[PDB]
Design a protein around this ligand. Structure first.
Ligand SMILES: Cc1ncc(C)n2nc(CCc3nc(N4CC[C@H](C)C4)nn3C)nc12
Ligand SMILES: [Mg+2]
Ligand SMILES: [Zn+2]
Length: 312
C-alpha cells in the first residue's frame, strides 16, 4: 500500500519538537499526511477523503501574515511531536482528532482578535459572545466535514463520531488564550495536590487544552531565527488591528500600537514570563517527555534578554 516518505533530512528532523515545515507550501499537505500515517496509522482515514479535506481546509485559510495555512500545519507538527513522545497516553480517537483539530484550529481567521470583532460589532460577535473566532473555527471545521467526499470520519460509529467532534470542539475552544490562564492554574494545582487523574475525562480535557496552547505557541520553541522571524508576522497582524482600532477612534493596547515598535523585546519578555514559560513548565510536569519545548522556550527567552542588553 501507499505511504508517504520524506527526504532523509525531513524524515529525521520532523520527529524533533523544533522542526520548521519550511517555505515550500506544496509539501505541507504531504508533511501532514506523513504525520497522520505515523501518529495514527495508514488505516485512520481514506486517503482520497483526507487529501480532499486537507485541500478544502487549506482553501479556507486566508492570506494573512500569521494566522494562515503555514501556522495551521506548524501547530499540527508540534501536536505530532507531543503524541509520538507520549505514545501510549492517548486513545485511538484522540490521535485521530487532535491533528485534525490543529489543522482546523484557526480556519477562516481574518487576522483580528475576538476583542476587535466585539468593538467593530462584526456579526460573529453577535452569534458567539465568547471565544468568538474559536467558535467560528469549529463551525468552519464542521462545514468542511459535511461537504461531499470530505467525511474522513465516515468509518466511525455514531458515538465514536460524536466523541471525536467533541474532542475537536474542546481542543479548538482551548486555543482561546483568554481561557489558557485559568486552565493552566487548575492544572498546576491538581498536579501539586497530586489529585491529577488522566482517567477523569474533565482532566484529560484540561491536559489536551494545555497541549493545544503549547502547539499554538510553538513559535517560541523553535531555532532562534524562526522565532525572531515569526515574531515579525505576529506583530504585523497586531499592528494592522491597532490601525483598525484607531479607525474606530479607540487607542489600541500597547501590544497592537506600531508606534511602540521599539518596546517589542520587552513585550516578548513579559510574554515568555506571563504566558509561554508557565505553559511549557506545567506541560513538562504533566508530560515529562515534552521537556525539549520548555528548554527551547528558555533558550529563546535568553535570546530576547540579549536583544535588550544590545548583545543582539
Ligand atoms: C510569540 C507570540 N506568540 C503568540 C502570541 C499570542 N503572542 N503575543 C505576542 C505579543 C507579545 C507582547 N508584546 C507586547 N508589547 C509589544 C511592545 C508593546 C509595549 C507591548 N506586549 N505583549 C504581551 N507575542 C506572541
Ligand atoms: Mg486562534
Ligand atoms: Zn493558532
Amino acid at each position: 500500500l501507499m505511504q508517504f516518505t520524506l527526504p532523509v533530512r525531513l524524515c529525521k528532523e520532523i520527529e524533533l519538537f523544533h522542526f520548521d515545515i519550511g517555505p515550500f507550501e506544496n509539501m505541507w499537505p504531504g508533511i501532514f499526511v506523513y504525520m497522520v500515517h505515523r501518529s495514527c496509522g495508514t488505516s485512520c482515514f481514506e486517503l482520497e477523503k483526507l487529501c480532499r479535506f486537507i485541500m478544502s481546509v487549506k482553501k479556507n485559510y486566508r492570506r494573512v501574515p500569521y494566522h494562515n495555512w503555514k501556522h495551521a500545519v506548524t501547530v499540527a507538527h508540534c501536536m505530532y511531536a507531543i503524541l509520538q513522545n507520549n505514545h501510549t497516553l492517548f486513545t485511538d480517537l484522540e490521535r485521530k482528532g487532535l491533528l485534525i483539530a490543529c489543522l482546523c484550529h484557526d480556519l477562516d481567521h481574518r487576522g483580528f482578535s475576538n476583542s476587535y470583532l466585539q468593538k467593530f460589532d462584526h456579526p460573529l460577535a453577535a452569534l458567539y459572545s465568547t471565544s468568538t473566532m474559536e467558535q467560528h473555527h469549529f463551525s468552519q471545521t464542521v462545514s468542511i466535514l459535511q461537504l461531499e467526499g470530505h467525511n474522513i470520519f465516515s468509518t466511525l460509529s455514531s458515538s465514536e463520531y460524536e466523541q471525536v467532534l467533541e474532542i475537536i470542539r474542546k481542543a479548538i475552544i482551548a486555543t482561546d488564550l483568554a481561557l489558557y490562564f485559568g486552565n493552566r492554574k487548575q492544572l498546576e494545582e491538581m498536579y501539586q495536590t497530586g489529585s491529577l487523574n488522566l482517567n477523569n475525562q474533565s482532566h484529560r480535557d484540561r491536559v489536551i487544552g494545555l497541549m493545544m496552547t503549547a502547539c499554538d505557541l510553538c513559535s517560541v520553541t523553535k531555532l532562534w531565527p524562526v522565532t525572531k522571524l515569526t515574531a515579525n508576522d505576529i506583530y504585523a497582524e497586531f499592528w494592522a488591528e491597532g490601525d483598525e482600532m484607531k479607525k474606530l477612534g479607540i487607542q489600541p493596547i500597547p501590544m497592537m500600537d506600531r508606534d511602540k515598535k521599539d518596546e517589542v523585546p520587552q513585550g516578548q519578555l513579559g510574554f515568555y514570563n506571563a504566558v509561554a514559560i508557565p505553559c511549557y513548565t506545567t506541560l513538562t510536569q504533566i508530560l515529562p517527555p515534552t521537556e525539549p519545548l520548555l528548554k527551547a522556550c528558555r533558550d529563546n527567552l535568553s535570546q530576547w534578554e540579549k536583544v535588550i542588553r544590545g548583545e543582539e
